[PDB]
Symmetry: C6
Amino acid sequence: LSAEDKKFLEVERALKEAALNPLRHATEELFGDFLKMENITEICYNGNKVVWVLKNNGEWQPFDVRDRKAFSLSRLMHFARCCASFKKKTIDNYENPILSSNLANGERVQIVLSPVTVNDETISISIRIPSKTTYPHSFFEEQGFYNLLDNKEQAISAIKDGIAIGKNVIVCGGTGSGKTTYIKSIMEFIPKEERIISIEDTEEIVFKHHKNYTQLFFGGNITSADCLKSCLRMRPDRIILGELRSSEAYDFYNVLCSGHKGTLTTLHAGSSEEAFIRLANMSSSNSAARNIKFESLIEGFKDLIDMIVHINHHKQCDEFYIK
Amino acid sequence: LSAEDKKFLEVERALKEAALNPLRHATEELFGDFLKMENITEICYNGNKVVWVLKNNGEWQPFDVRDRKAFSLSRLMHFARCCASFKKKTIDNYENPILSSNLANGERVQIVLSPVTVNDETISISIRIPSKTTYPHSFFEEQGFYNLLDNKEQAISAIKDGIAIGKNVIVCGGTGSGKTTYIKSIMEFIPKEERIISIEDTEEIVFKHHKNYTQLFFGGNITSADCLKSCLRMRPDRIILGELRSSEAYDFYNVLCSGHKGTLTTLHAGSSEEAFIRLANMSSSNSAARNIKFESLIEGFKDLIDMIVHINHHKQCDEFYIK
Amino acid sequence: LSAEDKKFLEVERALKEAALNPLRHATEELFGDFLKMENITEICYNGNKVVWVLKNNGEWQPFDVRDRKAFSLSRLMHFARCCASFKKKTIDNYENPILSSNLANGERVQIVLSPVTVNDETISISIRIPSKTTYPHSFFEEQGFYNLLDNKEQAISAIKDGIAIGKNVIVCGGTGSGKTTYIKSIMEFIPKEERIISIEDTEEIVFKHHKNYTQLFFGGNITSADCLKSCLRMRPDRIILGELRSSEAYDFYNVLCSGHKGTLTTLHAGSSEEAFIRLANMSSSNSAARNIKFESLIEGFKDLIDMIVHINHHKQCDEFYIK
Amino acid sequence: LSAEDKKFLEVERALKEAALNPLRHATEELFGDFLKMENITEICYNGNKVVWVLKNNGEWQPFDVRDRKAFSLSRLMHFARCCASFKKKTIDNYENPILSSNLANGERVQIVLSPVTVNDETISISIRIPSKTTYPHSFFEEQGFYNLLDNKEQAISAIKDGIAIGKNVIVCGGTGSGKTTYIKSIMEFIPKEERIISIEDTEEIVFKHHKNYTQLFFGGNITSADCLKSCLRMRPDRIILGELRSSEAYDFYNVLCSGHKGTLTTLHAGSSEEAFIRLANMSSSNSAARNIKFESLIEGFKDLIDMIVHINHHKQCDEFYIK
Amino acid sequence: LSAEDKKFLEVERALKEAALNPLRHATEELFGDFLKMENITEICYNGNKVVWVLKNNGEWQPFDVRDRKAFSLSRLMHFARCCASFKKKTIDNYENPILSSNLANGERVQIVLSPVTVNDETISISIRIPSKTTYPHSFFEEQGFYNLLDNKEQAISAIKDGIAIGKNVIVCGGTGSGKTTYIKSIMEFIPKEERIISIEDTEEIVFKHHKNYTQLFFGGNITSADCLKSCLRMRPDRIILGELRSSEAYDFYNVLCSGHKGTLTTLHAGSSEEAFIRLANMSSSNSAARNIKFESLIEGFKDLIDMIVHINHHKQCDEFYIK
Amino acid sequence: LSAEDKKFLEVERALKEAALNPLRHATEELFGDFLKMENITEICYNGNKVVWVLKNNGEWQPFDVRDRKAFSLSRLMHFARCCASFKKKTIDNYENPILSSNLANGERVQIVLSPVTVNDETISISIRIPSKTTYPHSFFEEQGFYNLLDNKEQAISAIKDGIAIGKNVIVCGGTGSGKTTYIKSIMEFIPKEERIISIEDTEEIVFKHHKNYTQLFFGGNITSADCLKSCLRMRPDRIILGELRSSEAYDFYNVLCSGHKGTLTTLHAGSSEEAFIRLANMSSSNSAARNIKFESLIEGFKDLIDMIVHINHHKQCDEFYIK
Ligand SMILES: O=C(O)c1ccc(Oc2ccccn2)cc1
Ligand SMILES: O=C(O)c1ccc(Oc2ccccn2)cc1
Ligand SMILES: O=C(O)c1ccc(Oc2ccccn2)cc1
């Protein structure tokens, strides 16, 4: 059975392998040492023989690689080229100098080539390391995630009871504030019996507590709207989005209007009142909202969203919006 | 007479049979056992050797199928492929990894393939089982469908007297709350002499009480709007719209504005006040309302809709909106 | 003279005849008996060996035709096919399962084929019989058309004097409420010397009282707007429209703004205040009104329309709106 | 000099003559007798062997032509065909059954053919006869054109002193109320030294009083807007627009906003307050006003238009609006 | 050096000469005598053997040319044809009967041919003569340009100090009111050291007082927006526009919003409050203002424009708007 | 390592060199002497044998070049041609007489050719010289940059403490007021450990104080928006946008709404209150804000922008807006 599955998948595996293998190899060649480093949130290269690692504690560390033969334009470009092709894209010094793509295991990768870089010797690479660990919610309490709030104990209960009861909750903050990580922690409180459907650009969320679920991924020609539209034909009890980014904020808006079972998602915002604004803006970009009152969007989102958690850049909750 | 009808239809039957036969066979191969199971509302597969059946009572049951050969990728993919082709569509691992289609008897099927699913061994299938039984309205009363309401006895009369009079009534709730089932029950009260025209994505409504009627179906190239447009040229006394989903919401709006008698439909909403908002949003997506005041849509729908029943996830009426 | 007219028209007559003859024949084959029946307003078939005739008194009568060889899919399809071709259209079981067309004498016909019908044995046909008789206005009084109104005598004078003086009047109601029939009755009061131009989808209005007039018809590529635009270059004293349906409601709106000689038309509405709304909606669908205040349309229509007559489903006036 | 002008124009004259000659002949054949008739405003044919002449006094006279051979379909259709071709258009019983065109001397012609007319023996023709005479303003006073008004003497001075000063004046009424005729009369008051530019669909205005002027004409590909655009580059002192019909209404608006002196035009409206509304509607149809407040258009036109004369259907001024 | 410049330009000169030479010749043939006449502002021909010259004093003088062989359709058409081709255009009696173009030295020329003219013997030509002289501002004072104003002395100082200080000033009036001429006069007050960039359709402005400047011209495919956009990359201290006509009014609007060094321009308006309206209208026609409040444009223009000068048709300032 | 980098880049270098070498040579030929000149901000040529250098102190110096051969049309045009080609564009006397391009070292060049310039001997060239020096903020204080303000000492602290905290600050003024120069000075206050990403049309900003950073450049096909989009995927701590010009204004808006830390940019505006208006206008031009309240944009920008410095044309701060 695991036999005939291999034969059936042979042509696909071989095709996928033709890209993976060289990329895997290039990724190890350059960034092996760095990707091994523990408690890091980004690996950046700035086309000047120095690799900058952002640690979880917020400190940037540089490492000298002027000796490395792997930080040669040829070797670097090969890696770019490998990167690009893996996700069915191109990257050149003409009409495609900017690449968003991924490493073998899914980590996001931003590459920038001349003439967008200062010169033709300058290649920019940015890798976003996800949290490797799934921290339990009790750990968030113990390291004082909630300690900035007046309503600290009342909040801890809000999230636990809220989630268990199927409230619409939004975790917001800036890039690297640990929104994803926190989402993963609170899934503890969703009953084990509920059916969960996640929607992501990369695998990140884990299912330590639930047995019945399905992960959706958007990419290339498949948008997050396509995933969300699919998701609603898959009899979900919980929808976990992961990121509101663009267009889809209107679909998500219309899901709330039909009073769905318990939605959970993340967004880039600076506060509760900002969240409602980022949502209304993102939603208006969807042409299907062409005739909708922008104040009606904000008032709409205010009516439906039960709880907002905001995270400052020192990974602490500085706003716990309820109702 | 039933003779020359067969000869006339011979080419069509043969063409339809070329897809039905294999699909019928594949469906029995995989899901026969589960489709046999009584009092279920969804059959899900999560590409992990486990079949998850949602029961009427709201509990999810998993079944082990790691020994069943039918649950091999090749066999699964054949089924997927059979499914797609039956409704004149394609499903692949490139530009068509999401499918909405149907089984031989009309049950809705959602299939998702790699690279939307987490890996290339992971195939998602979701089948919505309709209610197999047509419950009499007296059964609804007895099992206390109305028992949450203050205005319980006053509502039971509102629905019976209102329907029989030709009021515009809307049943709303979440996926699986028993909207369709409830609609079918209250058709009892529409006089037996009234001509009914139904509009559906699949057969579901039944005509136990009426002799003069016609069922319409929207499919690939034919929209619900086309059906509603046709419907208003078939001298209907009652129009029954299984579901308001998208654009057609404006057409339905303009049917009400023309006075029409005895409209009856369902919708995904959380509450009465939500229903009017979901209606106004859905309507605005119709560009024929490009210049229409969104507050004028909501006030319009409020003027025209006579009754709204909302159903919570425990299959009970928690709001009976009147006038 | 009637000689050379025949020769000149020979090629056209022959071409038109190629469709008429077979359709005439098919129509007699199937519906001859029914079309003969007196005091009927619709003939429906529901693809189940039963022909349903709606009578003027509002009762649906069924007739068994399971014996008829003319209610065979082949014979039925031929008739559909004849129907379609007569009005330069197609009707199939793929991309054209819905047909709006007409019988030889103009009666509207709605045909619906699988896969919009429940199965491939099910063919839906709906024929709208016009009133065969031109009732005099005194007959409307005698059968108490106006008897529901408080202002009964004051209304009878409003319509008679109104019309004679060239007021803009609108008759509204639901399909089959006798709007057309009533229009035809009140033409009695338009002075015999006035030039009338009618605009219709089918011949229905008759000129018992006027000698100087011209009938326009919209169909296929020619819209009602084209007819109305033409109509205003034909030095009319009265414009009789017959139905406001879609786009044209704006042209009709602009005709009133130039204070025309006396307009008369019908619309599907449930009341006076509804009429103004159906008008404003229909008008906004015309792109030429893209920048027009929707409240300015309704207030515009209120300024111009002198009299609205609404007819309930028991063919009685339940609202006589003046000024 | 008149010699070499003929040789130069020889090819054009010959080409123009190929259409004129047959049309001239056909027109004389059918309508000679009626065109000879004095004090008529429309000649209509209703495809029923009767020619209906509207007289200046508002009475319709029918004439029997069932013996006239000229009123055979072949001969009628030849005339239609001649008509169409003269203005570089086609008229058929398929995609071009409506024609707007002109006779040799410019009179407007509307022709309608089957299947717009009731049957294939029915051809509609409508010819608008312009006033043949240029009545002096003193004749208008004597026959009591102003006699309905309270401010009768104060108006006669308003028109004479206002025109001579360069006010923006608008004559409005219904088709046939004598707007054109009245315009021509008041040109007496525009100083003889002023340069006048007229803009018309046909020749109608005459220059009894002015020596320095130029007439513009809009035709198939050339719009009234193009004429107005050109006009403002011909150093006009007075612009006379026979009619505001459609888009150009915005251009006329922007001429006023540039201050311009001595504008004079006509329009279809029922009253002064209607005139401002017909103007604002017509203007909004020009997409160059896509972002303009519709109440700002009406307030704009009210700020700029100095005088409005309205003419009822008994050729009398029933409103002389000032300031 | 002036040697190799000739050789380099030889091919261009020859090509330009092929059009100039014949046009120069035709222009002399027809209008030589008239173009010599001093103190004229327009030369018009009306296709009736009479040449009408508008003098500066506002009087139209006719001259008889029925004897001239140069006023022959052939000769006239040749001149039209020469005119057209000079500016890479065509002019015919079909799809190009209207021509805007220029004489050798730049004077604007409007030609109109049949069928826009009354007949095929009628050719319209309008030539706009610019002021040949650059009057000093002291001359404007002496002939009492400012004498109509209450704030006469206070105005003379406003313009002198205003301009010197770099205020945004607008000269408005009707065609031929001497807006350009007045602009040229007040350039006296712009410091000799400031860098000036002009933008025109034809050369008209002169630089008697400044040594550092550049003239831009719009024409054919190059718009005034392209010129203005260029102009802002040329390190101007003063921008002199000359005419606001259409689209560009929004660019000009955005130049003011960045608080530029001192803008000076002309517009066709009847007053200060009209100027703000013509500006807001013209600006809205620019699609880039699609979402901008029209009251926000007018209030925007009011905030930025420091001084408006309006000129009546007797070449006097009747409004000196400040602040 | 620097070895194989040369071999890898050999083809690109050679291709880039084919344009650089001639341009480098031409630039030295014409403008070498002037480019050498110290304390200049623009070098202009006005196609009249005179080179006009704008000095830092605001005085324009002319230089005679009528003897220099380099200032012949052929030589000038070669330079123009060299210029165009370097940035993959064309410049001609037909469809491309305006060029925006750059010299070898990045200085902006505007060239204008006939027929935009007054004649075919007239070539316009404008070169914007960046500040060559990176002045320390203490120099700004000493030369009294802040001395016009009431809140002088309170502002010096506002900029130093605000920057170091991550406030969103905007420097605005007119072309040449020293916005760029001032930005570079205050970068001193951004902590040395912060990762900076710059976005520019040319290199100008320098990194005297920071080790971890990456410069982005927008060019023909690559927009500033693309750079900003990329930037937000490179884990920036500070984003420095040399200039807000057009569409990207909305993207910048949505960066602020996501909370982001330490944004820093420049803009052309006259004052703080102008800045918010230029921002809201620029933003609205982005169609992604099609449905956004323009007063909501201005109120949005006011909520997010923490500090605004305005610089008058005498290189001094005349407005230090806070909160
Ligand atoms: O006859 C039926 O309806 C039926 C359905 C399902 C079924 O599934 C299971 C059960 C346990 C483990 C695995 N599969 C067995 C039998
Ligand atoms: O000479 C004319 O002007 C003339 C016009 C019309 C006319 O038409 C008639 C009259 C009656 C019956 C039939 N045709 C006869 C003569
Ligand atoms: O060495 C330099 O920097 C230099 C620059 C410019 C220059 O230009 C002049 C001066 C006067 C007349 C003409 N050209 C001469 C020398």
